[PDB]
Amino acid sequence: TPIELKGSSFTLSVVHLHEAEPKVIHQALEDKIAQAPAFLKHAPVVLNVSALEDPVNWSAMHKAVSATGLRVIGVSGCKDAQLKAEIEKMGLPILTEG
Amino acid sequence: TPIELKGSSFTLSVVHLHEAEPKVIHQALEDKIAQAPAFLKHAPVVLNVSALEDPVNWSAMHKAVSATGLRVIGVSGCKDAQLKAEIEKMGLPILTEG
């Protein structure tokens, strides 16, 4: 009675990563935020990694994204075993699309 | 090309909180997680507070929920600017719920 568990859809902003170096991502997110500063400043985002080939230093990637003001709520599209196992270690949840 | 930002829909676990004491909520959550551990461990959750009432210690509730391993990524169905205000302090986003 105290809780109920449900499954519901939420639209979230997704950052689809295509290059891997944190600094390049930081610069690119900066430019993107400037396209709608009032909405994208401090926006909660999900990091999608489906299109990544090179390995990603996650702690460093998490800091580079966070430094732009964006707030990382988790990671999606992670279709690797180890890699998945990695992300979940720093308290970051894995999210899946509907 | 290094980045894309677009909205996507995500099917999420929503814990609907009802009238109660952080210890009780922590109790109820552990019992749910135990029934489906393979799926529920470190799951991302949204906390729906629409059924809560005037007095509620948000810091105590968030700590209790997080203690179960669940990863609170946002709050939904909020009903006052007070509680709301207390939520964005810790940087938790507010979500709208399908």
Author numbering:
A (entry chain A), B (entry chain B): 4 to 101
Please share excerpts from the published article on this structure.
Proper cell division at the mid-site of gram-negative bacteria reflects critical regulation by the min system (MinC, MinD and MinE) of the cytokinetic Z ring, which is a polymer composed of FtsZ subunits. MinC and MinD act together to inhibit aberrantly positioned Z-ring formation. MinC consists of two domains: an N-terminal domain (MinCNTD), which interacts with FtsZ and inhibits FtsZ polymerization, and a C-terminal domain (MinCCTD), which interacts with MinD and inhibits the bundling of FtsZ filaments. MinC is a critical regulator of FtsZ polymerization that is bound to MinD and oscillates from one polar region within the cell to the other.
We targeted E. coli MinC (EcoMinC) for a structural study and determined the crystal structure of the dimeric EcoMinCNTD at 2.3 Å resolution. We observed EcoMinCNTD as a dimer within the asymmetric unit. EcoMinCNTD forms a dimer via domain swapping between the first β strands in each subunit, as observed in the StyMinCNTD structure. Dimerization of TmaMinC is mediated solely by the MinCCTD domain; MinCNTD is not involved in dimerization in this species. By contrast, TmaMinC lacks the corresponding Gly and Ser residues and hydrophobic residues that stabilize the domain swapped β1–β1 interaction. To generate monomeric EcoMinCNTD, this antiparallel β1–β1 interaction should be broken and the hydrophobic residues will become exposed, because the long β1 strand cannot fold back to make the β-hairpin structure, as observed in the structure of TmaMinCNTD. Thus we see dimeric EcoMinCNTD in the result of size-exclusion chromatography, in a broad range of protein concentrations, as well as in the EcoMinCNTD crystal structure. By using unfused-EcoMinCNTD, we observed that EcoMinCNTD forms a stable dimer in solution and in the crystal, enabling us to conclude that EcoMinC dimerizes through both EcoMinCCTD and Eco­MinCNTD. Taken together, the results of our structural study of EcoMinCNTD reveal that domain swapped dimerization is a likely mode of interaction with polymeric FtsZ.
